[PDB]
Symmetry: C5
Subunit: 311 residues, 5 copies
């Protein structure tokens, strides 16, 4: 079967729509999400026109093999979508209404700069390649673009699902390609990060600072080194959940900065001990008293500077 012939020199318009049924498995590391949706296609094929009196039916149902169907593909998928045709309906003028239900693993990059307070725009790019006989162009039928109310993405808030109505038409290997951009806007549910990572990490840091109210070097060494180890554990935990980014993330910056605080606390604890042994505890006392104020103040100001730079 060949494509529909034109009335003039006009391209064939395939009206599209995606209606999300299921949204799942947003893998932060892989920068992928799985979708289960309806793909709706509509175009005119005057060769399929018919008389309702003669045929008996007001609308004819065809099997995909029986008629010409445009080869619509997803750009940013891992493998070809698993699709099952739901219906193909032809009206007397030859207007075809195609519907399939598909599932696909979409590959859409994520911006981790503001993690875990980041928002993303996930993309689903629809594409059609023009044939030699006719040029095929994609369109968005907004009445056929939407999402189910129950659509839930674990750890994410689904904001909107809209399509950029004007396709990106371009040449690829001496043939026209019509590409549509469906955008799923989401924002991360940061809640859990507060009791699971952020607050535990702050508590261990604050525990290290109790060494500023102790003259016991042996005890101080234990306090700062132990909490440092707990921080390393949280750092490894965070980096196992996130991909390796060529930029600094907000959590990354905070986690890294905290190492410097542990490093300087070790210096302070060492300096204080050196002085006590050198029979200069008056000088050591001045440093320890200053550290009690300096450490929380510098920590608070640095965090303000970071939150400012990132948000």
């Amino acid at each position: 079967v060949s494509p529909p012939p034109p009335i003039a020199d006009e391209p064939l318009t395939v009206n599209t729509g995606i209606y999300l049924i299921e949204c799942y498995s947003l893998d932060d590391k892989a920068e992928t999400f799985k979708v289960n949706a309806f793909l709706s296609l509509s175009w005119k094929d005057r060769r399929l026109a018919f008389d309702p009196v003669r045929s008996g039916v007001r609308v004819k149902t065809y099997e995909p093999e029986a008629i010409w169907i445009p080869e619509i593909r997803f750009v940013n998928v891992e493998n070809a979508r698993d699709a099952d045709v739901v219906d193909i309906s032809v009206s007397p003028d030859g207007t075809v209404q195609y519907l399939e239900r598909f599932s696909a693993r979409v590959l859409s990059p994520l911006d981790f700069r503001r993690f875990p307070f980041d928002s993303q725009t996930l993309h689903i790019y629809l594409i059609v390649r023009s044939v030699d006989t006719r040029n095929i162009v994609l369109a968005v039928d907004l009445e056929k673009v939407g999402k189910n109310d129950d659509v839930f993405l674990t750890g994410w808030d689904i904001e909107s699902f809209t399509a950029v109505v004007k396709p990106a038409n371009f040449a690829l290997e001496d043939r026209l390609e019509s590409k549509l951009d469906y955008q799923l806007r989401i924002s991360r549910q940061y809640f859990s990060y507060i009791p699971n990572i952020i607050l535990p990490m702050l508590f261990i840091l604050f525990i290290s600072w109790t060494a500023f109210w102790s003259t016991s070097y042996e005890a101080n060494v234990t306090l700062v080194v132990s909490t440092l180890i707990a921080h390393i554990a949280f750092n490894i935990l965070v980096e196992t959940n996130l991909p390796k980014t060529p930029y600094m993330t907000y959590t990354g910056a905070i986690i890294f900065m905290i190492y410097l605080f542990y490093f300087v606390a070790v210096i302070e604890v060492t300096v204080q001990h050196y002085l006590k042994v050198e029979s200069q505890p008056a000088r050591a006392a001045s440093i320890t008293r200053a550290s009690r104020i300096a450490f929380p103040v510098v920590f608070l100001l640095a965090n303000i500077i970071l939150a400012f730079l990132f948000f």
Copy 2:
């Protein structure tokens, strides 16, 4: 093949039933479960009616290709169910009795608030889309809804498998959809959490409190910081098994609260030492004696408050 024609303007009733054979792989993180069941479908097709006297046979068996079969789909599945038709039987009045055996990975959200003392209602939504010639409506045939006695879900108690008999009929892309809700009620087997997480976690906490019967700062620092590290290990273990929720879970609340107890024990241990060095051990002794009662009492009361808020 086209759908059965109506006597009046009545919709076509497809009587349904799901009989669970196998229930497995309830992934808490993915909020998915795998099912292996029988799907039973039954509708009247007057075109398939026959006289038992003339034909000789009491029932006719057809192959799926030979007759019209409604396109029944599951809403909350990852991919289309893997199905194998078991039997298609037509009675003289044209009543078709379809049976298939399927397997599918169902995506049904879980409420982790009361974890590990939580119960869930897993859902399996059946759906049919109406055609242009006729409107299709789903029904529940309760004699064909059930589960095998051997049906076991590791770490879960299967309470009931029932269907909400009245379908949710609604319009989707200018066509009627008939959706049925099959509910599998389960309750978690909390037993293992007691010796594996809860009691180990309480033991390490109680070990930290022995610092209230010690004047040795160096030993105290070791007791409280080491047990804190063991608690961090249990916290990381628990959060690796559970998904990130936008709410607090019972275990989450307890685990988080315990951090505060470690933080205050570090303060007490620091205060006691500071006073001893300041030659005020009488004041330190009052605080340490109070802490011996205060810590277990506040721990017990806080836990009562939490259990109350959560149950």
Copy 3:
């Protein structure tokens, strides 16, 4: 094709056999194992009978599509078995000899109570559903039930592969079902658990008890808390390899009991220190001397009690 017609009102006997070729991937957590075997089926179809003199041939070979083959399914599989027909041979009396080679992921529960000294009975349930024309019943041909000598299940000793010759005939959705139970008896190779978990766990426990030959509280605290942490690591390791059971396992019981020993050693270490500070080292010395005998004796007796209850 319809099933063979009966001579009287007798059911159709499908003689079965499973010959295991490959046994692999016994997942303790998933309670699943993968199998690769031969499935042999044999039944009489009088319609396929022939005279060896007239036809010339002693046996006729058919393609699965040409003749009626009973729809034999596995009950306890994740998905339908991947099968490939090897041969279909018809004898002059119409006796069909079917052979296929299949692979399937079998879901059979495990009893972890005696772990890692546990034995299991893995099941492979064969099933046939009766048709309206005839009732189908399964039988075991013991000459066609067996296993390859090379059949190895990593970390398990394959004891026997036998079938319960009398099928469990029952009604399911107003039709007769004939179910056969093939049992694969295995026993765990406990060897590795001794040098990898059991002995390391005992060594760390015995190291904690050296605190009974030390008056140094700071050193004692280090001994008991450090070894406790190593025990936690072994506990987490064991619980990551096993599923969550609503009962206590042997290893689980031992691991849990050892926590109590660590808890009481911390109490002893605390009591001894408190007394030394209170200028009562004579009383402390009595307790420490008693603990040296009490701890190993109570440990040995408790273990005897546990091994008794579990075996």
Copy 4:
């Protein structure tokens, strides 16, 4: 299509060959490897014979459906091989030359006794089942057995790929089976184990022995217990990479033996302290001086004994 008929009572010889293209994913735990290779089959079918003069062609090309092809299977595969026929060529005498390219996950057991200085013989068993009309026997065409030069198995040195030319002919379910053994000999690249596990493990052990040059019990306890914990980490790491064996592995033996050294160092550290407190430091000094020589000497000799028993 039926198999070729015999001239006498001779069996049909199917000449085989496997040419490895790709070798990957040798899973030590699963005892599996993935292969991508050419399978070549050759047999005489007199029915396909032709005169090159009359026909004009020197060779005829057939599609698999057109002619009889022997059902060749792999014994030790998880699932049936994914195969794609490359060519089927018939010579005038009726000699068929079949070639397919396949990929399969082969299940071949590993001997971990000498790990990580072990060598393995991976097997690929080819098999053919005899039909009722004729008995089929396999043969090895050595000009069609080989491997690509680029064939690389990460962390392994591919030594040889050869076939045991004489098949193992035997009866299975009253039919002859012809089994061929293709052996892929490999040897592990032990290099990485030296800087990643072996040397780190020895360094931590040697650090524990510095306690023999210290009278500080508190410091000694820290040295021996901390290094013991690092050893536990390496033990867990090693056992996560290897399967549970019913025998001792070389690395397993060394790792286990080292626990005894830590246990005896704790005893020495305890004994030395007990004596110092008992005002017998002269006796303690003799034991500590002896331990300085005894520990490395016994460690060296024990290792010689182990290497001897294992190699």
Copy 5:
């Protein structure tokens, strides 16, 4: 269908091109990457030639079954590529222009020597096997070799995608094979390794060196042993992300070298203590003062030596 017949004794040239659409999942451990691309094939088939005047059409479109298509395969793939034909266009001279969209998991070895500052050349080898009638040779059409601008490989910078225009023609099982090498040059994004592994590792090492400004053996032992344990954690982390190489990697060398520094710091800390106890603190003081300079100087020089040898 047979291949095109030659004009002389010339081989058939199949002009090829790969246009990368999607690049993902570069597994460092597996040494694999997944690709989604266009495969373009072009060859002359004189049998398909037509007159544009007589036929009316400028180009004829065929279905893959209708015409002869060369069996083009990928050498270094796990399984056969998942492919979907996009278009087949024949020009009047019989020039066929084939286009398919495929996805494949490519197995291409990586050189980890300079990790994480390494660059790789990923390969995609195209291959065609010659038939008996004609010899098939591959060519590169450079106008049909390229990549999408959006092509992103997480943690990698895509440098170039080019083809080695001259194929590697060779004999394999007495038939000519024409192999083309498509090279995708990439370079790792080392950024993240600096704050995640490199700097944390240096900080813990520098913390160990504060023991050179302490006379407290107990505190020193804690400093050096604790930081050593944190280093072990980073070593295990790094080796879990990388495959086992028969050579030293840059990171591997640095990580290993740092163990020696910890070992020598333990010796220094032990020597200093031994001397203090022997009433020789003057000699101990000389060693500790030297170590303060020696350790950073030897560390800096050793690192210069390593960076030199590796880059």
